[PDB]
Design a protein around this ligand. Structure first.
Ligand SMILES: Nc1ncnc2c1ncn2[C@@H]1O[C@H](COP(=O)(O)OP(=O)(O)O)[C@@H](O)[C@H]1O
Ligand SMILES: Nc1ncnc2c1ncn2[C@@H]1O[C@H](COP(=O)(O)OP(=O)(O)O)[C@@H](O)[C@H]1O
Ligand SMILES: [Zn+2]
Ligand SMILES: [Zn+2]
Lengths: 564, 564
């Protein structure tokens, strides 16, 4: 009745042993990049699936069952994917259970969000009615409003009660609290994670002082409600007559210089309004982008902007020669430091010598890629003679092998470099190596690198930043860092607009645009606008109804602490 | 905790509902062709595997788990198949557990018996250490001596106790008695089977008067011990200096005009002596067969034989135009009957008109194949005008659509046809359609068709029949029929030699040649020869040790019945 993992070493896992109870709803949590993903998927799921299919770096796994993953890793349509040939009767019910009743059967699978695709996959799997299976789920709350949280949990417990084991990788409060058993992975992330910090009932995890997760679940840590909301400064964008998909001829004003959250249940029209209409219309007017925007009459207030930038979880680059140091430009500052050493000068090495993208200093066998690791440079990317030049006893490959946090100390006497490294540290990437290849960064890591570069950029207040569900993949502690960074962009007078369901984010927003009231044909209207406090009071707003008790909970936690 | 099958219709299954308890050793039994195979494999295993792989004619199946089959349906070697690169340490132990410790790691997988291949597959599967799996096993006792029966049962119960369900298709007494739950399928076979006759504990099945299986388990029915053993009549074959594989320079005499059983544990040298040496040497001397015989000095007594015939479970033909009626030649007798009808005469139809193998009377669209069923003849194989000729109101396609037993009644006034049909009835194929295509016959069916044709053949007493494990696939009631037929061949003065582990067969033998004492390097010697009673007394003979209590059990049952 237990899955026994012994000596798990995948990625950053530190040769760990873990017991997971079978026939239970088990949640694995931790920071983004803690190793929770390596444990659930690269280790447990991979081994369980491999063993059945016969018909990962680990010593032994005992008590495995044949495993099925439910993630986004899987022109067809909704109808073809669920084999069903607006939401024969059996399947349709499962689509409703996973919160997808607003989808049409004709919908291109290629145009579903990742959260939608994941939930179609979940529906198909519930349809199988299998027992004795080990299900491994990645973050099933993605794309789901707090209102649908209870039904998701009930759906998971129903699969469990059929006689299956559920391993759920999550950061969502309610899911963790509803778990049979909860495992906190990683003190930190990467090199700083990969350990079992705490394991037991949610209640036992809350009472464990070592557990970062337990400290947030118990209230010892929380994201505060901001003292004041920023007020509009007279600059508005206005979307006029938005009609794309289910949007009911919507007009709405967006205040610049504020942190704006677009909210609403799944299928309410959030992504249509923001991605299909606003982003595409702005990108076409501002950057001459090709993509045809969704149906709308007009967008006013374009005189206020120079640029629109969507920050998503797509890669920062396509080669190993791209990394966090090259993306932020801290790489070029480092090359300048090496070029300024006595030994570089004596040898006549200019900055170009310390670039792995040009002939001279790079390893010529791998053209500076490092890669199987190149037999010549062993992945260091530079030839032997270049590597003899050191700054403070370190060569350029050793520098690129430093974590952001160690590089911060190492470059303490170079302000320009410090300032760039601080942005990466502040976004939550202190653990990451400067030279980590773009090809190996997770989605969340890539979004955070991009945010770090934006934070550094000189601002004129004329940029609109758009982020579609940026809390995807993030622990509440990661979210605190994300919010710190996003609010700092707004302080420059730029505008941050997020599509979110996460109430930790929403409660810190200056301004909310709530769509609905429901999804599909029953959505596409503006339900409420205003501050979190204003939306909290609107009875017809599902977002408000769930937001109100969060504002109250976290105001009370603030007032309890002032009682110091 | 139950697998619920509702409305199963595969092959001969008669729209049945069945409950199978989960986490148990469940045995499905019945006659050969009862439908037990259609239930376990075509229905339960197929659905369980299909459902997992997404990641059969049946209404619904509830409580399925991902399913793994253990049969013979799966140049590589023992080493490569178990991935192991005489019986790293983990796997070797499993090969011992399944009774394969005499195998070498270099052995060609292509030269393993079906029973050996099945047990390698079983070993690999135990190696997986999976839980929550539904295992479906076809006849795992194939090739296994009674001595290894207890260990096989312990091995199965160990897989169950790991937390799996075992559905075992079997006819073996001890396996049935050791079952948690036992299901008796089919009153008869084919059209006469496909129903759940009895289901419960083995004890409950024994106490059910409807159950053919229970009647044999309880002793109400049994195969008797013959009154007298046939004595040699002066004709002997002698194998001289057999050295192939593990055979220790063996010389042994075989008495013709008797029923001979070659016995011994797995790997003792049975198939080497009989198939590799005896059969190949005789086939080369008598029929100029090409295959090089195994190493031996000589074979004496060839003056006594005209032919050697191996009867196995390979197909009777390769096309649909081959069937039990064509193989036995009863087809040609039927064509004669049609050619003799008034209407055939009036029309000038000769016997050739009623052959689907020649132009004129056959359906020309499918060249007489019947096949998707041909859109023209609808599978009847003949054109419209031929089908207008009837005998006793039936046309030739209707005759071919008759079961052997119905055809027996229908042709009651044609002795020649009756005599051929009786052979098929006597081998146990009363249920089978005369025209059933060779391409659709099971292994056991094909062997039985061949035996029927042999039984009909005029004999000079100069044939040696060899059968390698002919009880494969057979219920003890099927075995009684098989033995009746084989003993009738011996009555003609021909010789029947079987390789067997089945003690129901062995106890009826006139003469036993027992190899061993163990398998592999520890086998290859003649342990004992003589009557069953003589071998029963030999302490060093594993065959004798298990045979003795069977002779006693069944002699006592005979004496109890005489107390009528
Ligand atoms: N490409 C498309 N084709 C057809 N219908 C779509 C498409 N994209 C979105 N919709 C429909 O429009 C409605 C709003 O969808 P969406 O904007 O994705 O909601 P949200 O982003 O708030 O979850 C939904 O009912 C959805 O089924
Ligand atoms: N083709 C082969 N190559 C190597 N060894 C073999 C081959 N066939 C049989 N043997 C070995 O000879 C011994 C006797 O095998 P076999 O005659 O198949 O035993 P039985 O038929 O009694 O089970 C076994 O130990 C087996 O491993
Ligand atoms: Zn190189
Ligand atoms: Zn035809």
């Amino acid at each position: 009745d237990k899955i026994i993992v012994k000596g798990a070493r995948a990625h950053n896992l530190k040769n760990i042993d873990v017991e997971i109870p079978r026939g239970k709803l088990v949640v694995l949590t931790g920071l983004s990049g803690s190793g929770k993903s390596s444990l659930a998927f690269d280790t447990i799921y991979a081994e369980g699936q491999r063993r059945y299919v016969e018909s990962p770096d680990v010593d032994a796994i005992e008590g495995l069952s044949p495993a099925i993953s439910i993630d986004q890793k899987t022109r067809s349509t909704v109808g073809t994917v669920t084999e069903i040939y607006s939401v024969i009767r059996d399947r349709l019910g499962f689509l409703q259970n996973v919160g997808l009743d607003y989808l049409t059967l004709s919908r291109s699978a290629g145009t579903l969000s990742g959260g939608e695709a994941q939930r179609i996959r979940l529906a198909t799997q519930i349809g199988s009615r299998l027992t004795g299976v080990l299900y491994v789920l990645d973050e099933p709350s993605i794309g789901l409003h707090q209102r649908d949280n209870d039904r998701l949990i009930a759906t998971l417990k129903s699969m469990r009660d059929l006689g299956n084991t559920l391993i759920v990788v999550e950061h969502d409060e309610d899911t963790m609290l509803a778990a049979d058993y909860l495992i906190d992975i990683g003190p930190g992330a990467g090199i700083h994670g990969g350990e079992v910090v705490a394991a037991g009932t949610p209640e036992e995890v809350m009472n464990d002082p070592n557990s970062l997760t337990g400290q947030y679940l118990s209230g010892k840590k929380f994201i505060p409600i901001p003292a004041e909301r920023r007020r509009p400064d007279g600059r508005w964008l206005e979307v006029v007559g938005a009609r794309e998909h289910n949007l009911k001829n919507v007009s709405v004003k967006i205040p610049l210089g504020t942190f704006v959250a677009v909210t609403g249940v799944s299928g309410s029209g959030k992504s249509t309004l923001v991605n299909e209409v606003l982003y595409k219309a702005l990108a076409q007017k501002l950057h001459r982008a090709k993509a045809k925007p969704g149906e709308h009459r007009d967008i006013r207030g374009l005189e206020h902007l120079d640029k629109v930038i969507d920050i998503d979880q797509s890669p920062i680059g396509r080669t190993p020669r791209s990394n966090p140091a090259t993306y932020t430009g801290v790489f070029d500052d480092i090359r300048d430091v090496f070029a300024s050493t006595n030994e570089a000068k004596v040898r006549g090495y200019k900055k170009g010598r310390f670039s792995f993208n040009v002939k001279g200093g790079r390893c010529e066998a791998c053209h500076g890629d490092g890669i199987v690791p190149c037999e010549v440079c062993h992945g260091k990317r530079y030839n032997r003679e270049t590597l003899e030049v050191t700054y403070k006893g370190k060569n350029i490959a050793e520098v690129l092998d430093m974590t952001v946090e160690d590089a911060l100390d190492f470059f303490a006497s170079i302000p320009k470099i410090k300032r760039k490294l601080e942005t990466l540290y502040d976004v939550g990437l202190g653990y990451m190596k400067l030279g980590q290849p773009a090809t190996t960064l997770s989605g969340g890591e890539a979004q955070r690198v991009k945010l770090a570069a934006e934070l550094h950029r000189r601002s004129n207040g004329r940029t609109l930043y758009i982020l579609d569900e940026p809390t995807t993949g993030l622990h509440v502690d990661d979210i605190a860092r994300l919010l710190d960074v996003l609010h700092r962009l707004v302080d420059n007078g730029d505008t941050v607009l997020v599509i979110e369901h996460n109430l930790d984010v929403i409660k810190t927003a200056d301004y909310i645009i709530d769509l609905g009231p429901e999804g599909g044909d029953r959505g596409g209207q503006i339900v409420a606008v205003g501050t979190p406090e204003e939306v909290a009071e609107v009875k017809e707003s599902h977002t408000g109804r769930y937001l109100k008790p969060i504002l109250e909970r976290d105001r009370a936690r603030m007032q309890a602490r002032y009682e110091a």
